[PDB]
Design a protein around this ligand. Sequence first.
Ligand code: 4XD
Ligand code: 4XD
Length: 150
Amino acid sequence: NQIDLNVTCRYAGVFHVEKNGRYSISRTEAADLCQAFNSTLPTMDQMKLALSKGFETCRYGFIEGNVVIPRIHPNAICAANHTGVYILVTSNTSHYDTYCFNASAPPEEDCTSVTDLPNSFDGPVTITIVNRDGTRYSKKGEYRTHQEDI
Ligand SMILES: COCCN1CCc2cccc(N)c2C1
Ligand SMILES: COCCN1CCc2cccc(N)c2C1
């Protein structure tokens, strides 16, 4: 009973989380996951500011209201070569990564490691935060509040 949460640097408080390194988060789970980081799903405005500070990924993830990919550099295999906050229009499926927004983060780029999942609740899952530099923090707990996500 183990979950890896791979987390990025924060940019104006916005970061990306993937569960087990593959698209596997529903919209309800995404909200719960951000809540566990004392964070919320970003607004479009929040994501645009993060982009302006250097944030880009090659992953679809939830924000409030849409699924998006922030792009700075055009790449043919990431958001069909678009730049800016690319909005997913047409998809059959419901599971993506998520973005999260932590208002208490620094205003620009913060690439220090994440060492806590401060708002996880009691539970039986070994949850491991994995930073890009390999630094890990584990705890026993849970964050999913919807049964359909478990
Ligand atoms: C209100 O949350 C109830 C569900 N949680 C409550 C806390 C908890 C602790 C250890 C194992 C499990 N399964 C659980 C389940
Ligand atoms: C946005 O990056 C998607 C690719 N994955 C690749 C695997 C991985 C491992 C640990 C932390 C992070 N951020 C990542 C990122």
